[PDB]
């Protein structure tokens, strides 16, 4: 996008020898490769953005964090900054990681970002100073760790709840004020554009809604008309798979129509669409089709009355994509 | 011109970090010391990422990093 003006491509090096198991953090091969490649030079910060799956147990998470700490000790010189991401869990025995970071780093700062999701337990730890001398094996250190005091536990939990509530309020305020504003974007969006990032609205629309363009409202109108007539014709022609596929097609067409009309006119054609998307599903009935500005005919509505109303449940990835699409339509159009 | 604009912006937004400066209630030190199921309402602001949209958080943490990390040493990224 920048035309390699900053030569970012040329200055990125990859630690890889060809053998796949030399990449996961919990293996000794990764540590050996990193030490071999980096022991003769100085690095400033170690950023460890693990995926943090809910499937992984606490023992695995502590093992990966200990491996990252050991790598930082091995290759990192003084004035090294370890940035890490943690996901606290409602399981009461969750402070072992915090005790570990306290044990190995004296200066640790816990940060609750406001740009991140304010409905999920995500925190960032920045550790600066180190004092330990001998890095014992993983098993003995894991057995050594113990939970934290109850007073500190409750204080940290209360602080987390307060920060999450404040972040949620700030996010709602920013969303509302961005929707209110006419045609200017936030400073961070302009900064991202200057850095070189690209808007994903057209891309997400193309590979989720299968609509090449969102500003061509008329073509979307005829596409929706053909889609609804075809789905009603097939449904009256007649199993579960075909019904699910056609319901998905109809819901996608309706979502594309709503996105296009909100982007162009400046108002959704169903005031409950935003809330339904937020809770994670899309409902299409005959009532809103009738309330919709007349585009279909009476026979189409009568055939729709046989089905009446459908409700389609999205999963996490589709919910994220749809939610991003709604945000883009809101923030990249007229009020 | 693109490099000049990038330098100008990153030197201009030092005082206020792109309307994302952290307050005193968000940073804590261990020595010094969710709401309704799962909602993805924060993704309306993630409009500049194609593969991974998680590029806004780096812009947020950049203030602290450029505050306390050395700029003349290499960096290592895991995961």
Supply A195's token pair.
């850095």
Q: Which of A249, A223, A255, A245 is nearest to A322 (CA)?
A: A255
Q: Are A198 and B47 in contact (CB under 8 A)?
A: no
DSSP-based three-state secondary structure for A161: helix
> Breaks in chain B at C–N > 2.5 Å: after which residues?
33
Phi and psi, residue B63, nearest 5°: -60, -50
Q: Do A46 and B29 touch (CB under 8 A)?
A: no
DSSP characters over A22-45: GSSTTSHHHHHHHHHHHTTS-EEE
Q: Are A141 and A99 in contact (CB under 8 A)?
A: no
A322, with CB counted inside 10 A (0-12, 13-18, 19+), is buried
Supply A87's token pair.
């996901």
Give CA B19 to chain center in angstroms.
11
Rounded CA Rg of chain A: 26
Q: Do B76 and A25 touch (CB under 8 A)?
A: no
Alpha-carbon span A258 to A253, nearest angstrom: 9
Alpha-carbon span A23 to A197, nearest angstrom: 27
Cited resolution, angstroms: 3.3
Supply B18's token pair.
């792109």
Report chain B residues whose CB lies below 8 A from the CB of A328: 44, 47
Q: Which residues pair with A110 in a beta bridge?
A: A125, B28
Experiment used for this model: cryo-EM
Alpha-carbon span A190 to A185, nearest angstrom: 7
DSSP-assigned letter for residue A111: E
Between helix A217-237 and helix A240-264 the angle, nearest 10°, is 160
Alpha-carbon span A148 to A150, nearest angstrom: 7
Alpha-carbon span A289 to A301, nearest angstrom: 7
Phi and psi, residue A130, nearest 5°: -130, 145
Report chain A residues whose CB lies below 8 A from the CB of B66: none
DSSP-based three-state secondary structure for A170: helix
In the block, tokens 């162009």 appear at A264
Q: Are B76 and A139 in contact (CB under 8 A)?
A: no
Within 10 angstroms of residue B10's Cβ, the number of other Cβ atoms is: 15
Q: Are A87 and A57 in contact (CB under 8 A)?
A: no
Rounded CA Rg of chain B: 16
End-to-end alpha-carbon separation of chain A, Å? 30
Q: Which residues pair with A285 in a beta bridge?
A: A309
Max Cα separation, chain B?
Answer: 48
Alpha-carbon span A317 to A323, nearest angstrom: 10
DSSP-based three-state secondary structure for A127: strand
B7, with CB counted inside 10 A (0-12, 13-18, 19+), is exposed
Helix segments in A41-125, DSSP class H:
58-75, 96-104
Phi and psi, residue A317, nearest 5°: -65, -45
Q: Do A278 and B39 touch (CB under 8 A)?
A: yes
Report chain B residues whose CB lies below 8 A from the CB of A61: none
The answer to whether A121 faces chain B, any CB pair under 8 Å, is: yes
Alpha-carbon span A94 to A173, nearest angstrom: 32
Sign of the Cα pseudo-torsion (A260, A262, A268, A272, in order): positive
Q: Are A214 and A205 in contact (CB under 8 A)?
A: yes
Report chain B residues whose CB lies below 8 A from the CB of A331: 44, 47
> Breaks in chain A at C–N > 2.5 Å: after which residues?
238
Q: Which residues pair with A83 in a beta bridge?
A: A47, A126
Supply A307's token pair.
């089905």
Q: Residues 123..182 of A with a Cβ closer than 8 Å to B: which?
A: 124, 126, 128, 152, 155-156, 159-166, 168, 171-172, 174-175
Cβ-Cβ contacts under 8 Å for A153 (sequence gap 6 or more): A95, A147
Give the helix, strand, coil percentages of chain A, each rounded to 5. Answer: 55, 10, 35
CA angle (B42, B43, B47) in 5-degree steps: 135
Within 10 angstroms of residue B36's Cβ, the number of other Cβ atoms is: 8
Q: Which of A122, A214, A156 is nearest to B33 (CA)?
A: A156
A108, with CB counted inside 10 A (0-12, 13-18, 19+), is buried
Q: Which of A298, A197, A310, A172 is nearest to A253 (CA)?
A: A310
Within 10 angstroms of residue A294's Cβ, the number of other Cβ atoms is: 9
Give the dihedral of Cα atoms A304, A307, A311, A312; nearest 10 deg: -90
Q: Which of A277, A52, A279 is nearest to B38 (CA)?
A: A279
Three state DSSP letters for chain B: CHHHHHHHHHHHCCCCCCCCCCCCCCEEECCCCCCCCCCCHHHHHCCCCCCCCCCHHHHHHHHHHHHHCCCCCEEEEEC
Q: Pick the residue of A84, A113, A124, A319 with the most B CBs within 10 A to test the interface with B by mutation.
A: A113
């Amino acid at each position: 996008k920048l035309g390699n003006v900053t030569q970012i491509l040329n200055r990125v090096k990859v630690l890889f020898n060809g053998n796949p198991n030399s990449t996961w953090i919990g293996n000794m091969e990764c540590e050996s490769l990193i030490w071999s490649e980096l022991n003769d030079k100085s690095i400033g910060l170690v950023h460890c953005d693990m995926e943090g799956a809910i499937g992984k147990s606490e023992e695995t998470v502590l093992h990966e964090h200990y491996s990252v700490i050991r790598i930082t000790y091995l290759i990192g010189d003084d004035d090294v900054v370890l940035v890490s991401k943690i996901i606290p869990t409602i399981t009461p025995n969750w402070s072992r990681i915090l005790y570990l970071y306290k044990l190995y780093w004296k200066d640790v700062s816990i940060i609750s970002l406001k740009t991140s999701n304010p409905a999920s337990t995500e925190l960032y730890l920045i550790s600066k100073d180190a004092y330990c001398t001998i890095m014992e094996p993983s098993e003995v250190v894991l057995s050594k760790l113990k939970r934290l005091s109850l007073l500190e536990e409750n204080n940290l939990l209360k602080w987390i709840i307060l920060s999450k509530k404040r972040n949620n309020e700030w996010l709602h305020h920013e969303i509302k004020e961005g929707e209110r504003d006419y045609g200017v974007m936030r400073p961070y969006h302009m900064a991202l554009q200057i850095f070189g990032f690209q808007i994903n609205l057209n891309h997400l629309a193309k590979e989720f809604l299968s609509t090449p363009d969102l500003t061509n409202i008329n073509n979307i109108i005829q596409s929706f008309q053909r889609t609804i007539k075809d789905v009603l014709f097939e449904w009256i022609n007649i199993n579960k798979g075909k019904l699910r596929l056609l319901s998905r097609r109809l819901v996608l067409s309706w979502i594309s129509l709503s996105l296009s009309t909100r982007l162009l006119t400046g108002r959704f054609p169903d005031e409950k669409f935003e809330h339904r998307a937020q809770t994670g599903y899309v409902s299409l009935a005959d009532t809103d089709l009738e309330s919709l500005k007349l585009l279909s005919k009476n026979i189409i509505k009568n055939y729709r009355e046989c089905i009446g109303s459908i409700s389609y449940w999205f999963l996490t990835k589709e919910v994220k994509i749809l939610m991003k699409l709604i945000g883009g339509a809101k923030l990249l159009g007229i009020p | 011109i693109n490099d000049n604009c990038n330098k100008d912006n990153k030197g201009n937004k030092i005082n206020n970090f792109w309307g994302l400066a952290l307050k005193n209630y968000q940073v804590l030190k261990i020595r010094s010391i969710l709401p309704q199921g799962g909602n993805y309402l924060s993704h309306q602001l993630r409009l500049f990422g194609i593969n991974s949209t998680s590029c806004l958080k780096a812009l947020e943490l950049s203030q602290i990093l450029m505050k306390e990390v050395n700029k003349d040493k290499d960096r290592l990224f895991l995961g």
